[PDB]
């Protein structure tokens, strides 16, 4: 009937470190539909200001599609009600070596221009008492990515979230991404990409562990 234990813990953990995405507390419990109608209205206006003919079949539904996309899709991560269900199992295997999930599909939106960020994450962790379900790592990366973002902040949030859930600081996150506000606009750099890393526990502390992780990052197909 509310946020899960994990959603709450992770959110609290992020607020405490001052890492939460700039979001304002629920000012009014207004149904999403009203938000979507409102947003669509604004988009109708913007399109009119761009002199686009909204009468055309190809543009007619765009304001509603954009509203739905903002509220229901690309920024779904802002609502913790969409936080992934987390499942863990006892580390009976007694695994004390890192588990790495590489090339995680990452789709995000840069907050400076509200434009596509296309990337891939690599997450590693040394299991302590529990082993997390592999897909949950993918879902967590994707939860934070479905928000207007700053890559540097995104990498931190995923790290903190995982540390919190796994009960260990021994987590490492790395994200490699192409920002379309850099690529298809402005400086229009067709080839560059940005890499950001957030190292936890031994990944930070131990150069041995650190470089094992870093060496593993970016392995072509």
Ligand X SMILES: Nc1nc2c(ncn2[C@@H]2O[C@H](COP(=O)(O)OP(=O)(O)OP(=O)(O)O)[C@@H](O)[C@H]2O)c(=O)[nH]1
Give residues in contact with ligand X (CB under 6 A): 61, 65, 85, 87, 110, 112, 131, 133-136, 139, 149-152, 179, 181-182, 186-187
Q: Find the helix or strand (DSSP H, E) in which 153 lies.
A: helix 151-166
Task: Answer yes or no: is 181 a known binding residue.
Answer: yes
Residue 123 CB contacts under 8 Å (≥ 6 apart), including other chains: 100, 101, 104, 137, 141, 158, 162, 171, 172, 173, 174
Q: Is 11 in the site for a second copy (CB under 8 A)?
A: no
Is 116 a binding residue for a second copy by CB under 8 A? The answer is: yes
Region 18-37 residues binding a second copy, contact defined as CB under 8 A: 18-19, 22-27, 35
Q: Which does 156 bind (CB under 5 to 8 A by kind): ligand X, a second copy, none?
A: a second copy
Burial of 131 (0-12, 13-18, 19+ CB in 10 A): middle
CA–CA distances in Å: residue 130 to residues 87, 88, 167, 193: 10, 6, 8, 34
If one asks whether residue 5 binds a second copy (CB under 8 A), the answer comes out as no
Residue 110 is assigned to a ligand binding site: yes
Please count the other Cβ atoms lying within 10 Å of the Cβ belonging to residue 70. 20
64 annotated ligand-binding residue: no
**DSSP, res 81:** G
Residue 85 touches which of ligand X, a second copy, none (CB < 5 to 8 A by kind)? ligand X
Residue 5 binds: one of ligand X, a second copy, none (C-beta under 5 to 8 A by kind):
none
Residue (22 or 207) nearer to ligand X, CB: 22
Q: Which stretch binds a second copy (CB under 8 A): 2-10, 161-169, 185-193?
A: 185-193
Token look-up 């499942």 returns: 87
C-alpha to C-alpha distance for 10 and 5, rounded to whole angstroms: 9
CB of 155 to a second copy, least distance (A): 8
Q: How far is the CB of 58 from ligand X (least distance, A)?
A: 8
Choose one: 5-13, 63-71, 161-169; the region binding a second copy (CB under 8 A).
Answer: 63-71
Per-residue contact string for residues 122-161; x = within reach of a second copy by CB under 8 A: -----x---x-xxx--xx--x-----x-xxxx-xx-----
Sign of the alpha-carbon torsion through 76, 78, 80, 86: positive
- Cβ neighbors of 18 (< 8 A, separation 6 or more) are none
Q: What are phi and psi of 118, to 5 degrees?
A: -115, 110
* Numbered residues of the known binding site for Zn(2+): 110, 113, 181
């Amino acid at each position: 009937p509310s946020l899960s234990k994990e959603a709450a813990l992770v959110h609290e953990a992020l607020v405490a470190r001052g890492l939460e995405t700039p979001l304002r507390p629920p000012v009014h419990e207004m149904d999403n539909e009203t938000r979507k109608s409102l947003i669509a209205g604004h988009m109708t206006e913007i399109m009119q200001l761009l002199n686009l003919d909204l009468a055309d079949d190809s543009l007619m539904e765009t304001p509603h599609r954009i509203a739905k996309m903002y509220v229901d899709e690309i920024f779904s991560g802002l609502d913790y009600a969409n936080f992934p269900k987390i499942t863990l199992i006892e580390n009976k295997m007694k695994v004390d070596e890192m588990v790495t999930v590489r090339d995680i599909t990452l789709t995000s939106t840069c907050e400076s221009h509200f434009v596509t960020i296309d990337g891939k994450a690599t997450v590693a962790y040394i299991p302590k008492d529990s082993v997390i379900g592999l897909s949950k790592i993918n879902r967590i990366v994707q939860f934070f990515a479905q928000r207007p973002q700053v890559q540097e902040r995104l990498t931190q949030q995923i790290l903190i979230a995982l540390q919190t859930l796994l009960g260990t600081n021994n987590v490492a996150v790395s994200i490699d991404a192409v920002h379309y506000c850099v690529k298809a606009r402005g400086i229009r750099d067709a080839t560059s990409a940005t890499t950001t890393t957030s190292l936890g526990g031994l990944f930070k502390s131990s150069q041995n562990t650190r470089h094992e992780f870093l060496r593993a990052v970016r392995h072509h197909n």
